[PDB]
Amino acid sequence: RIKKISIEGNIAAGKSTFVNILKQLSEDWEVVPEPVARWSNMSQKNGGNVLQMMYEKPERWSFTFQTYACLSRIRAQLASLNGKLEKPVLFFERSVYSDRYIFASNLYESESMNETEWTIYQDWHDWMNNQSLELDGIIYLQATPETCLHRIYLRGRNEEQGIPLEYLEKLHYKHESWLLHRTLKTNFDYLQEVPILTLDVNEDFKDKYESLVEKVKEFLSTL
Amino acid sequence: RIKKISIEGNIAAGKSTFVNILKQLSEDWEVVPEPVARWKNGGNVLQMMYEKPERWSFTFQTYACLSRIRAQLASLNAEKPVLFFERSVYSDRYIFASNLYESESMNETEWTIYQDWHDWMNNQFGQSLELDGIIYLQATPETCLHRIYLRGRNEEQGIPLEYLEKLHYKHESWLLHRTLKTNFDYLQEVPILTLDVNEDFKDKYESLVEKVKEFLSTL
Numbered sequence: 001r002i003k004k005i006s007i008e009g010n011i012a013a014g015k016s017t018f019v020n021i022l023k024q025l026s027e028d029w030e031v032v033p034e035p036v037a038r039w040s041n042m043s044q045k046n047g048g049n050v051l052q053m054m055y056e057k058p059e060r061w062s063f064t065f066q067t068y069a070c071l072s073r074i075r076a077q078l079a080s081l082n083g084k085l086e087k088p089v090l091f092f093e094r095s096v097y098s099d100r101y102i103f104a105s106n107l108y109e110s111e112s113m114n115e116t117e118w119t120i121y122q123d124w125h126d127w128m129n130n131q132s133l134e135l136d137g138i139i140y141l142q143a144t145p146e147t148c149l150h151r152i153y154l155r156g157r158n159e160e161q162g163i164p165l166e167y168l169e170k171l172h173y174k175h176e177s178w179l180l181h182r183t184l185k186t187n188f189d190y191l192q193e194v195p196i197l198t199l200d201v202n203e204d205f206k207d208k209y210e211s212l213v214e215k216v217k218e219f220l221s222t223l
Numbered sequence: 224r225i226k227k228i229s230i231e232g233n234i235a236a237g238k239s240t241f242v243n244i245l246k247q248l249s250e251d252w253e254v255v256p257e258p259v260a261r262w263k264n265g266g267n268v269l270q271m272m273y274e275k276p277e278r279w280s281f282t283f284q285t286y287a288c289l290s291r292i293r294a295q296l297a298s299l300n301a302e303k304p305v306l307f308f309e310r311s312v313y314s315d316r317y318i319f320a321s322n323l324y325e326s327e328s329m330n331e332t333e334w335t336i337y338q339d340w341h342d343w344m345n346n347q348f349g350q351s352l353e354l355d356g357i358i359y360l361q362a363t364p365e366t367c368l369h370r371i372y373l374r375g376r377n378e379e380q381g382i383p384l385e386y387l388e389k390l391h392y393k394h395e396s397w398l399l400h401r402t403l404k405t406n407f408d409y410l411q412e413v414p415i416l417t418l419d420v421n422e423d424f425k426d427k428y429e430s431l432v433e434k435v436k437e438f439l440s441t442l
């Protein structure tokens with residue numbers, strides 16, 4: 001019996017950092033890192049190609065990217081149900097919900113996907129998933145768009161130095177509608193009541209992470 | 224129990240005609256017809272695919288092949304049931320997406336990604352969408368183009384002849400010479416039936432339907 005937890009947060013808030021932190025702390029704790037972040041500096045080929053494209057001309061490629069990136073996530077968390085794990089916990093790096101209600105939905109609103117692409121994507125999504133990876137909990141790593149902005153700066157990936165404060169602000173608002181106010185409605189009945197834990201990570205924690213983690217073990221003890 | 228046979232063939236060779244014909248002759252005989260034939264968003268995407276195919280080919284193929292996949296999964300649930308599909312997931316790939324890639328309307332990345340996906344879309348869900356046999360409706364491309372005009376269609380009245388030829392050779396290679404190799408290995412074995420439908424058969428299909436039965440009798 002493996003519990004599944006999704007760790008969520010904006011570009012550069014500290015997800016793979018944190019995710020690599022609890023990694024080391026438990027033999028019963030495994031993580032699945034988001035394939036998009038690894039393409040991000042032969043699936044690596046396809047993955048590498050589509051990301052630069054996506055940046056250069058989102059209005060052309062958001063639909064091919066979002067489907068490929070989401071397919072990539074389903075097969076990764078699947079191959080992890082196997083892999084490992086007495087008191088198992090699987091941490092996901094972001095989820096198939098993130099894909100759709102944060103990134104895909106955002107590109108429609110931005111018009112980089114038209115009604116047709118969005119409507120198709122929505123039922124591919126709806127369908128692709130009805131056919132196991134339901135989550136037991138959600139951890140929300142909360143940071144302001146300016147913290148993420150400088151942390152994209154401490155990361156120094158080429159492509160992301162472009163990314164402007166306004167796109168981060170945009171994504172922040174959607175994480176807050178979804179994970180705090182629980183304002184957003186989904187087409188997945190259960191994700192209206194998945195328990196959620198919200199961690200504030202504006203303060204660095206790379207070597208001052210004990211409370212965060214005590215908070216994690218608590219919430220985990222209450223599932 | 225429920226055998227699945229594919230009716231294959233170039234555009235307007237007569238596939239929609241033969242399966243409807245076959246459909247009235249036996250309580251054991253049902254069919255699942257390809258959605259592109261049928262073509263809301265499928266209709267916008269189809270229309271866009273005629274407009275700027277270098278833009279919409281990847282998107283159309285996706286939707287077209289999963290729109291097919293579910294349709295056939297929906298049908299899959301008499302004494303000797305036989306379900307004929309109006310083409311298969313293989314047609315989608317090794318006839319159409321192929322060609323479109325070959326014609327540069329998909330780039331390498333697009334192509335590789337689609338093959339990957341397909342590879343996975345039709346394995347995860349291979350539970351009986353797998354074919355028992357294939358019936359190749361064989362027509363000359365010059366025949367298929369009269370039937371293009373016969374069927375009288377908006378967008379269709381301009382199919383260059385040359386395209387139909389693009390589609391012929393691919394069929395012949397897969398279906399006649401059997402030169403074409405895949406990643407659906409079973410496929411390079413499965414019995415194929417080659418039918419000549421150059422002669423109109425709308426009201427003369429007994430010889431056609433005789434063979435289909437001699438054929439089904441050996442599976």
Ligand SMILES: O=c1ccn([C@@H]2O[C@H](COP(=O)(O)OP(=O)(O)O)[C@@H](O)[C@H]2O)c(=O)[nH]1
Nearest residue numbers: 012013014015016017151154155204205206
């Ligand atoms: O407490 C922290 C958390 C994160 N980071 C840095 O912020 C950048 C982006 O964080 P990460 O890649 O983990 O964010 P993700 O987007 O994966 O959430 C990296 O340079 C991390 O070193 C940091 O310096 N202090």
Ligand SMILES: O=c1ccn([C@@H]2O[C@H](COP(=O)(O)OP(=O)(O)O)[C@@H](O)[C@H]2O)c(=O)[nH]1
Nearest residue numbers: 234235236237238239240370374423424425
């Ligand atoms: O023996 C035949 C078979 C077909 N057709 C006509 O050819 C057109 C296209 O055939 P169909 O839609 O069946 O071809 P498909 O694309 O479905 O292979 C239709 O208007 C048919 O009525 C015909 O006149 N004689």
Ligand SMILES: Nc1ncnc2c1ncn2[C@@H]1C[C@@H](O)[C@H](CO)O1
Nearest residue numbers: 036054055066069098099100103104
């Ligand atoms: N679905 C997605 N998952 C993870 N990251 C995504 C997704 N869609 C877009 N991105 C990011 C945002 C940006 O860094 C780049 C393309 O804009 O990829």
Ligand SMILES: Nc1ncnc2c1ncn2[C@@H]1C[C@@H](O)[C@H](CO)O1
Nearest residue numbers: 234259272273284287288315319320
């Ligand atoms: N996958 C496909 N299945 C059936 N027809 C297709 C497919 N891809 C393209 N077509 C045809 C070719 C042309 O007649 C029209 C527009 O591309 O649809």
